[PDB]
Ligand binder design. Structure first.
Ligand SMILES: CCCCCCCCCCCCCCCCCC(=O)OC[C@H](CO[C@@H]1O[C@H](CO[C@H]2O[C@H](CO)[C@H](O)[C@H](O)[C@H]2O)[C@H](O)[C@H](O)[C@H]1O)OC(=O)CCCCCCCCCCCCCCCCC
Ligand code: CLA
Ligand code: CLA
Ligand code: CLA
Ligand code: CLA
Ligand code: CLA
Ligand code: CLA
Ligand SMILES: CCCCCCCCCCCCCCCCCC(=O)OC[C@H](CO[C@@H]1O[C@H](CO)[C@H](O)[C@H](O)[C@H]1O)OC(=O)CCCCCCCCCCCCCCCCC
Ligand SMILES: CC1=C(/C=C/C(C)=C/C=C/C(C)=C/C=C/C=C(C)/C=C/C=C(C)/C=C/C2=C(C)CCCC2(C)C)C(C)(C)CCC1
Ligand SMILES: CC1=C(/C=C/C(C)=C/C=C/C(C)=C/C=C/C=C(C)/C=C/C=C(C)/C=C/C2=C(C)CCCC2(C)C)C(C)(C)CCC1
Ligand code: OEX
Ligand SMILES: [Fe+2]
Lengths: 28, 35, 30, 52, 136, 34, 334, 59, 137, 34, 37, 451
């Protein structure tokens, strides 16, 4: 079943974008 | 040096006038559709 | 003496360009 | 004299007679066919196929 | 890591040292780039490269210019490098601030923070400040 | 059933809220040279 | 019947060997003069003051060069943007010293290439073709006019124009890097993607046709002789190459339409070179690429280096060394 | 009073743009009701003159 | 906070001219006070030298040098319009200055056209017009 | 000191960016001439 | 900045030049809702 | 739905406004809606440019492009390029904003409720593209407006307030144009110059008397030629050369608008008369000369003879001689020896830079100007940090000249591509083969052998 094919690529991608939005608000 | 210069304006507006009066020579009608 | 070889390579290249355009094997249908 | 503000780069008077005899020598060729035609003949096309 | 020992800068000609509050170092950068930084970017002077904002070059001026009280002195009255005559007519100042529209609205604390930035920047970047393009 | 153009609209403006958020933090925070 | 109609019938005849056309009336005299002056100026031409400092740079073969180092040198810094023909030079020796033939070649080149482009339109009109091959040729015409015409305009001199040579090209590219930072500019980025993508889809389309050829030859003769010229049968199974690429990546990423496929091959490079040639154009007027130098700092305020700071120190090396005698003042305004 | 009328001028132009192309793209809504809408144009134009009046008086 | 870019007003303690600025307004506690005499004495000094730069005008028109008269009224006299507009405070003082300018713009408009009397006529319309300016205020 | 400017800008884009598709969404519900 | 009777609307004015870009995107949203037909 | 799908027309959704060629009401509503957007931007941008205005920084450091066009007209500008008021800039941005709501309503009325073709109901406004009497009338009506719009510059520069002359004697100020230049040897002198260096075809107009005197002749031509094309009909040679169709007129404009696109992008780089350096910042040529003049002043104070100061190459370090003989500045700045600027023209002579006037008469406003134009040279980056390409990130400046010369120049190539696309199609749509080659009748097969 193809739920292992997409979500090996999409479950990381949303997790890293949760971090890239947090790094916009980090300052010195 | 003013003898060469005369020779260039002959050659330019010879071919520029062939260009200008080329497309005035009913140039859209020269197609393979008709005439 | 050295630049004589470079000139011969350049005009020799322009010869085979001339023969390829005008003496080309003209393709024919049937 | 390069940066002079002269029309078409015409520095001397002799260069004019070059320009006038260039446009006119081909104009007179052009009038030999497309000149002396009817200037009052229209069409409702996008493109005219009138004559030579 | 802006420790208060690093923010502590020299304030008078005698040699007393006071500290800069963290709004002084922040307004000190925004005002310096907006006002002074067109020519004094990074400590070098574009229009006269001999007279820089180096801590060596500020010290060798005939009035010593390293202090905060000496720099705000220069802003309200800019003499030359040997301090004999005034160049207020050509350097932007407070005395000649009718010609320069950029300095018609500056308070005492605003020059206190701009001069704070000129003094605290060689302590942050030791060799980049006024070192030219070699130390970019 | 949801119309497909509503799905591309909401996700499409969601990307704009993600992209313009990234061009925001080029001028603020880290990497802004402030 | 008239002499002009018998001349218009010949000059627009497709029955000529090479179609001349009305653009060939100013393509052929322009490009043969750009050619015949280039061959002489590349082989036998004396050195040229390019920096305007009376230090003449040799560029021709008779003055000790080769194919790589020899180049038609751009005109002087002393002239700059001024029009400098032969008759405004008081001798040919004064013309060849100050960078004469660079302006004669380039100005007859850009007229002849902009007329070669309109000539590709004209024959498409007289042959019944849909017209737009000449729009695809606008992309190298945009790029030729960017480095020979537009960049000397915004920098105010033909001396910053591109040297007509091979080593002169890399003198042009490196000095353009230090002064304008082209690699960080997003329009060189959009045309590296245009030619890496262009050479991809070239070799990707050319392989899937050659993969799916139909048996028409034997194993002794050549593969190419299974195509007779002017035949009406299709020479490759296009359903086969669609099912291959439909499994090589996935199904929905494959063009079954061969017309939309052969359009995407024309879109991607040409749009990539239109955008790139308007990178040189907007950097001709000193709107440079990105500059992220000293952008990352710690909380103390010390500059933390990035890859752009390492790239900056490569730009500072070329900036302090290009035209090592021409400068007198601390900022390269030109 | 200028800050009160311009704030009333913006809120009407919010109310029009949501409703006027809806009133036109519908096959009959503009013909059935435009004398309702024509008041809102005449109110909207009248506010621009009132604000232009109040700006010249105040300067 | 140190690297906050869009802190328009929460950062600083003093009120700014606008959120899109760095500078404080022209209100109190400023170091530039425009009522000072040395700003008035600077603007008055260029008005005095302007008459001295304007009496050298006919010496070049008595000679043949038209390039020196076109720029004598722009070399030093560039700082005039900044001062005479600034010294013009009252009502009738203001519409006295455009009498001086229109008389001065015809000196430059005649120097480019190389008219000898039209410079010498309009020069006397300028010395008499700055006489009207300085004597009032 | 609650940063009224950014609160004003982010609401006023979201009013305007949602006033555009609301012209279309109100037409799709109405089944008018799109 | 704006005159004193208009300093209130300084956030709304900042959005206003962006709005012509939103008409370009309004065409595609309208083509999506019509079903590209 | 008929007329709005590919089954009825034959055009896809992406080439969807090509369905508007042979309807006239939908096409009119489209041209008045895009005119509603051109207005709307200019009103909303100036309000954006007013709300971010600060009196401290100069007019060009703050990065504006539209409130510097109105300062050339003379609104709110003081002497020396000092913007004073900024209440009249608010007034202009509202009239170009309210009016777009009216032009907006014409675009939403004429294209959603207006009749599809005007030729049925409204015989004055209705037309056909193949008609040649009507199209010269539409050209004629819309040429007399461009004549009248050119006199509004002339009325405003002679009667209503005046315009900003940067060459005005005594300093740059709002000056009434009293005596404009009406000499056709001078006014059409510009139009027939060389476009190269030194002549500089139409960019090189160097005083406001030729500008305002020139916009008179434009109003004379555009009215007489407006009346010419209303009355007359295209001649025999003009009917044979053109394609009288809908898209062909569009590709005629796109060629000419690209001519205007490059030229406005080259005004902004070189011209310092229509675009004063007090407002738009120093030009490319001007900031190269201001550097050499600043270090001229710097080393003259060190007691150095700057005329005899031998340069490192053997040329003049400070003063050298141009290839026409004039005394100029030396360096890489020898290429920009045609730089005519209001702060350097006080030091000119017949020969050039007068050495006696450099040794004695340098005024401190010129030193304040050349130091200002050195540090604000038009050299920038896309993230808006100034200086050279290797400058560190501290300043925030890109010149408004470099935004105009890189964006209108950017567009002016793509509109030259619009002349190539839309005229290739229109010439082939007139001939019939824009859809492809006929399989039954191929024109190549009925030709000679190939050779
Ligand atoms: C054509 C298309 C085909 C391309 C073939 C090109 C070969 C054609 C033959 C050569 C013509 C070249 C055009 C030269 C343009 C140029 O040097 O233009 C420069 C001039 C600007 O002139 C400058 O004008 C200046 C005028 O300034 C003077 O006057 C000013 C007055 O204020 C200031 O005072 C200033 O300080 C003072 O110096 C100086 O004189 C400079 O020396 C002078 O160079 O612009 C002008 O002519 C106006 C702008 C002309 C449009 C330029 C378009 C460029 C074409 C690029 C097309 C790319 C696409 C190709 C597709 C094919
Ligand atoms: C409703 C009508 C109306 C209109 C249109 C105006 C308009 C204006 N008033 Mg006004 N006013 C009005 C009613 C109106 N007022 C009323 C009822 C009163 C009370 C009796 C006043 C009292 C008043 C005073 C006391 C003053 C004004 C002033 C002004 C001007 C401000 C600009 C300026 O400083 O001048 C300088 C001029 C300009 C900046 C030119 C602005 C116009 C340009 C050309 C933009 C137009 C472009 C174009 C039309 C737009 C494109 C649209 C196109 C798509 C069709 C402006 C033109 C001031 C004035 O005139 O001072 C000079 C002023 O002091 N008003
Ligand atoms: C004012 C000038 C003008 C006018 C009225 C038209 C009008 C038309 N064009 Mg034409 N065109 C123009 C200029 C113009 N064009 C230019 C300058 C070019 C060269 C780029 C073209 C190239 C062109 C092509 C290649 C085609 C047309 C087509 C058409 C027809 C349908 C257009 C359509 O549905 O597009 C709808 C619009 C879109 C789908 C959007 C396109 C995507 C753009 C590029 C995105 C915008 C990018 C960015 C956000 C904004 C640009 C940034 C930049 C300004 C810095 C219509 C007759 C079509 C045709 O032939 O019909 C007969 C067609 O196939 N045009
Ligand atoms: C400059 C932008 C512009 C403009 C003015 C137009 C205008 C038009 N297009 Mg069009 N188009 C554009 C860009 C544009 N297009 C682009 C970029 C594309 C490519 C995606 C297309 C693709 C396209 C297609 C495929 C078709 C059109 C069609 C049409 C015409 C009729 C639309 C209609 O009746 O449907 C009804 C329209 C709607 C229901 C849309 C409602 C949206 C409303 C009007 C928005 C109003 C918002 C505004 C802020 C309100 C102001 C109100 C005022 C009171 C203040 C109309 C003239 C059609 C045509 O050819 O007609 C024959 C058609 O088939 N267009
Ligand atoms: C160039 C733009 C343009 C053109 C050609 C038309 C053309 C037309 N419109 Mg239209 N319209 C436009 C813009 C335009 N409109 C705008 C902007 C709006 C919004 C206000 C409208 C709103 C509108 C409505 C509501 C109606 C029309 C109607 C009509 C048709 C008949 C008009 C009539 O009775 O004529 C004769 C009319 C007059 C002589 C009155 C003219 C008065 C104006 C103010 C004179 C203009 C002054 C000046 C020239 C403009 C200067 C500003 C400029 C610099 C921008 C006609 C085809 C009618 C129609 O089709 O019937 C169903 C109709 O009902 N139009
Ligand atoms: C928006 C501008 C605009 C546009 C698009 C047009 C469009 C057109 N005009 Mg028009 N025109 C305009 C403004 C405009 N006009 C103005 C302002 C004037 C007043 C000067 C004229 C005067 C005018 C005349 C007198 C004629 C046209 C003609 C034409 C048609 C195309 C011819 C052409 O472009 O040849 C481009 C050709 C050139 C740029 C060079 C032509 C050189 C001429 C033929 C040499 C003969 C000398 C002649 C007497 C002029 C003396 C000047 C000099 C060359 C010696 C076309 C309908 C022709 C037509 O068909 O009339 C209805 C025509 O005969 N126009
Ligand atoms: C993306 C769209 C876009 C945008 C935002 C701009 C933006 C701009 N363009 Mg532009 N341009 C564009 C696309 C764009 N361009 C394209 C695609 C082209 C074709 C290649 C051009 C070609 C172009 C030219 C040729 C020029 C500009 C110019 C300008 C600038 C000033 C606008 C102007 O002159 O108004 C023009 C407004 C009108 C024509 C409307 C009529 C105005 C009337 C006549 C004014 C009357 C004034 C009068 C004195 C007032 C007195 C009133 C009193 C009597 C009461 C501005 C930055 C100008 C500029 O500054 O160049 C650097 C310029 O010369 N553009
Ligand atoms: C869009 C792309 C941009 C388009 C170009 C923009 C227009 C540029 C401005 C053009 C200037 C036109 C002014 C008149 C010409 C001028 O004075 O040049 C005349 C200049 C002046 O020439 C020099 O002038 C000097 C004086 O300072 C000296 O006297 C020199 O001796 C003299 O040579 O010479 C040239 O530039 C010659 C140009 C030759 C090019 C002709 C090719 C054109 C063929 C195109 C086909 C014709 C169809 C188009 C016509 C319709
Ligand atoms: C003037 C004014 C006003 C008004 C405004 C307006 C009304 C505006 C409009 C605007 C608009 C009009 C908007 C629009 C928007 C839109 C959007 C934002 C969209 C987007 C989206 C996206 C982008 C998506 C898309 C897509 C799809 C859907 C599918 C396919 C694909 C794609 C992805 C493309 C007001 C009142 C405020 C007041 C002030 C003034
Ligand atoms: C404002 C001003 C001015 C004025 C202006 C003028 C006066 C103008 C003129 C203008 C003009 C006077 C222009 C002209 C143009 C022209 C053109 C540009 C042409 C074109 C043509 C064409 C396009 C053609 C084509 C063709 C051919 C070639 C062949 C056949 C076909 C045809 C016909 C199509 C001055 C300078 C003082 C200064 C500044 C200000
Ligand atoms: O000539 Mn060729 O390279 Ca363009 O930067 Mn400036 O100028 Mn020169 O130096 Mn660097
Ligand atoms: Fe293929």
């Amino acid at each position: 079943f193809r739920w292992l094919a997409i979500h090996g690529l999409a479950i990381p991608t949303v997790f890293f974008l949760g971090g890239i939005t947090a790094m916009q608000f980090i300052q010195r | 040096m003013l003898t060469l210069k005369i020779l260039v304006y002959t050659t330019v507006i010879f071919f520029v006038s062939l260009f200008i009066f080329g497309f005035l020579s009913s140039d859209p009608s020269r197609n393979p559709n008709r005439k | 003496m050295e630049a004589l070889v470079y000139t011969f390579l350049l005009i020799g290249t322009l010869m085979v360009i001339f023969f390829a355009v005008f003496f080309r094997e003209t393709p024919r249908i049937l | 004299t390069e940066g002079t503000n002269e029309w078409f780069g015409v520095d001397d008077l002799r260069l004019l007679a070059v320009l006038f005899l260039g446009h006119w020598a081909i104009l007179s060729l052009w009038l030999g066919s497309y000149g002396d035609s009817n200037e009052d003949e229209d069409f409702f096309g996008e493109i005219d196929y009138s004559a030579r | 890591d802006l420790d208060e020992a690093t923010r502590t800068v020299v304030v008078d000609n005698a040699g007393n040292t006071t500290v800069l509050t963290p709004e002084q170092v922040k307004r000190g950068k925004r005002l310096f780039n907006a006002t002074c930084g067109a020519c004094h970017v990074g400590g070098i002077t574009k229009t006269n490269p001999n007279v820089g904002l180096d801590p060596e070059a500020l010290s060798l001026a005939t009035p010593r210019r390293d202090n905060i009280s000496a720099l705000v002195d220069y802003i309200k009255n800019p003499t030359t490098y040997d301090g004999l005559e005034s160049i207020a007519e050509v350097h932007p100042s407070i005395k000649s601030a009718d010609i320069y529209p950029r300095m018609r609205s500056l308070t005492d604390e605003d020059l206190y923070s701009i001069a704070g930035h000129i003094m605290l920047s060689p302590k942050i970047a030791s060799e980049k400040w006024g070192g030219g393009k070699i130390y970019y | 059933r949801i119309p497909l153009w509503l799905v591309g609209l909401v996700g499409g403006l969601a990307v704009i809220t993600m992209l313009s958020l990234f061009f925001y933090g080029s001028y603020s925070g880290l990497g802004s040279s402030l | 019947v008239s002499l002009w109609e018998r001349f218009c019938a010949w000059i627009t005849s497709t029955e000529n060997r090479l179609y001349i056309g009305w653009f060939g009336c100013l393509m052929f005299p322009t490009l043969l003069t750009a050619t015949s002056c280039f061959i002489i100026a590349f082989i036998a031409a004396p050195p040229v003051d390019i920096d305007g400092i009376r230090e003449p740079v040799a560029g021709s073969l008779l003055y000790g060069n080769n194919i790589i180092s020899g180049a038609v040198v751009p005109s002087s810094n002393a002239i700059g943007m001024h029009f400098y023909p032969i008759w405004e030079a008081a001798s040919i020796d004064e013309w060849l010293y100050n960078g004469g033939p660079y302006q004669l070649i380039v100005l007859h080149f850009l007229l002849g290439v902009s007329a070669y482009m309109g000539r590709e339109w004209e024959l498409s009109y007289r042959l019944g073709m849909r017209p737009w091959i000449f729009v695809a040729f606008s992309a190298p015409v945009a790029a030729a006019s960017a480095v020979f015409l537009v960049y000397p305009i915004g920098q105010g001199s033909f001396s910053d124009g591109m040297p007509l040579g091979i080593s002169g090209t890399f003198n042009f590219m490196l000095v353009f890097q230090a002064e304008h930072n082209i690699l960080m500019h997003p329009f060189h980025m959009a045309g590296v993607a245009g030619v890496f993508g262009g050479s991809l889809f070239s070799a990707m389309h050319g392989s899937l046709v050659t993969s799916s050829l139909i048996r028409e030859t034997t194993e002794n003769e050549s593969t190419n002789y299974g195509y007779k010229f002017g035949q009406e049968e299709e020479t490759y199974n296009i359903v086969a190459a669609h099912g291959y690429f439909g499994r090589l990546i996935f199904q929905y990423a494959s063009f079954n339409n061969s017309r939309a496929l052969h359009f995407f091959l024309a879109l991607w490079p040409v749009v990539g070179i239109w955008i790139t040639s308007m990178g040189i154009s907007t950097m001709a007027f000193n709107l440079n690429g990105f500059n992220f130098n000293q952008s990352v700092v710690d909380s103390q305020g010390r500059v933390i280096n990035t890859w752009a700071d390492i790239l900056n120190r490569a730009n500072l090396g070329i900036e302090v060394m290009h035209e090592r005698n021409a400068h007198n003042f601390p900022l390269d305004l030109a | 009073m200028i800050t009160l009328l311009v704030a009333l001028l913006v809120l009407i132009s919010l109310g029009l743009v949501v409703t006027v192309p809806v009133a036109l793209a519908t096959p009959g809504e503009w013909e059935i009701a435009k004398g309702k809408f024509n008041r809102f144009f005449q109110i909207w134009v009248f506010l621009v003159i009132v604000i232009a009046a109040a700006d010249g008086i105040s300067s | 906070s140190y690297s906050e870019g869009a802190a328009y007003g929460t950062d600083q303690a003093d009120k700014l001219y606008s959120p899109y600025s760095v500078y404080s307004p022209e209100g109190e506690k400023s170091l530039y006070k425009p009522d000072n005499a040395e700003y008035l004495a600077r603007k008055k000094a260029v008005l005095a030298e302007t008459k001295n730069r304007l009496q050298k005008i006919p010496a070049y028109v008595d000679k043949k040098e038209w390039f020196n008269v076109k720029d004598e009224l722009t070399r030093y006299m560039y700082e005039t319009r900044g001062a005479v507009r600034s010294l013009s405070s009252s009502v009738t003082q203001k519409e006295k200055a455009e009498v001086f300018f229109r008389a001065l713009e015809d000196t430059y408009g005649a120097a480019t056209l190389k008219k000898g009397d039209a410079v010498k006529a309009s020069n006397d319309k300028a010395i008499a017009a700055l006489d009207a300016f300085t004597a009032t205020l | 000191m609650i940063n009224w400017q950014v609160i004003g800008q982010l609401m006023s884009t979201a009013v305007i960016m949602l006033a555009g598709p609301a012209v279309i969404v109100l037409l799709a519900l109405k089944k008018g001439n799109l | 900045r704006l005159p004193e009777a208009y300093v209130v609307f300084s956030p709304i004015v900042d959005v206003l030049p962006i709005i012509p870009v939103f008409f370009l995107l309004l065409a595609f949203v309208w083509q999506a809702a019509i079903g590209f037909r | 739905i008929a007329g709005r799908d590919i089954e009825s027309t034959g055009f896809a959704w992406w080439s969807g406004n090509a369905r508007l060629i042979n309807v006239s009401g939908k096409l009119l509503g489209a041209h008045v809606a895009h005119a509603g957007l051109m207005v709307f931007w200019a009103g909303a941008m100036v309000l954006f440019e007013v709300s971010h205005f600060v009196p401290e920084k100069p007019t060009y450091e703050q990065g504006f492009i539209l409130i510097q066009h109105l300062a050339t007209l003379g609104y709110g500008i003081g002497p020396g390029g000092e913007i004073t008021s900024t209440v009249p800039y608010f007034a202009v941005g509202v009239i170009h904003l309210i009016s777009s709501a009216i032009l907006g309503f014409g675009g939403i009325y004429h294209s959603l409720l207006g009749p599809d073709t005007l030729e049925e109901s409204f015989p004055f406004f209705g037309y056909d593209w193949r008609d040649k009497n009507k199209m010269t009338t539409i050209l004629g009506i819309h040429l007399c407006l461009l004549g009248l719009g050119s006199f509004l510059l002339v009325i405003k520069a002679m009667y209503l307030g005046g315009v900003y002359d940067t060459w005005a004697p005594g300093g740059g100020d709002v000056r009434y144009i009293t005596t404009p230049t009406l000499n056709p040897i001078v006014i059409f002198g510009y139009v027939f110059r060389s476009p190269f260096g030194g002549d500089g075809w139409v960019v090189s107009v160097n005083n406001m008397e030729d500008v305002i005197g020139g916009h008179i002749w434009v109003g004379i031509l555009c009215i007489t030629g407006g009346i010419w094309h209303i009355f007359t009909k295209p001649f025999a040679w003009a009917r044979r050369a053109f394609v009288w169709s809908g898209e062909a007129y569009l590709s005629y404009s796109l060629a000419a608008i690209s001519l205007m696109g490059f030229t406005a992008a080259l005004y902004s780089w070189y011209n310092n008369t229509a675009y004063p350096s007090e407002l738009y910042g120093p030009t490319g040529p001007e900031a190269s000369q201001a550097q050499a003049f600043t270090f001229l002043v710097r080393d003259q104070r060190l007691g150095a003879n700057v005329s005899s100061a031998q340069g490192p190459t053997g040329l003049g370090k400070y003063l050298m001689r141009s290839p026409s003989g004039e005394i100029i500045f030396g360096g890489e700045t020898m290429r920009f020896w045609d730089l005519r600027a209001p702060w350097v023209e006080p030091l000119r002579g017949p020969n050039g830079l007068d050495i006696n006037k450099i040794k004695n008469d340098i005024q401190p406003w010129q030193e304040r100007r050349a130091a200002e134009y050195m540090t604000h040279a038009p050299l920038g980056s896309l993230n808006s940090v100034g200086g050279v390409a290797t400058e560190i990130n501290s300043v925030n400046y890109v010149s408004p000249r470099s935004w105009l010369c890189c964006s209108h120049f950017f567009l002016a190539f793509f509109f030259l591509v619009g002349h190539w696309w839309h005229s290739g199609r229109a010439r082939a749509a007139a001939a019939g083969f824009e859809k492809g080659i006929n399989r039954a009748n191929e024109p190549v097969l009925s030709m000679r052998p190939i050779d």
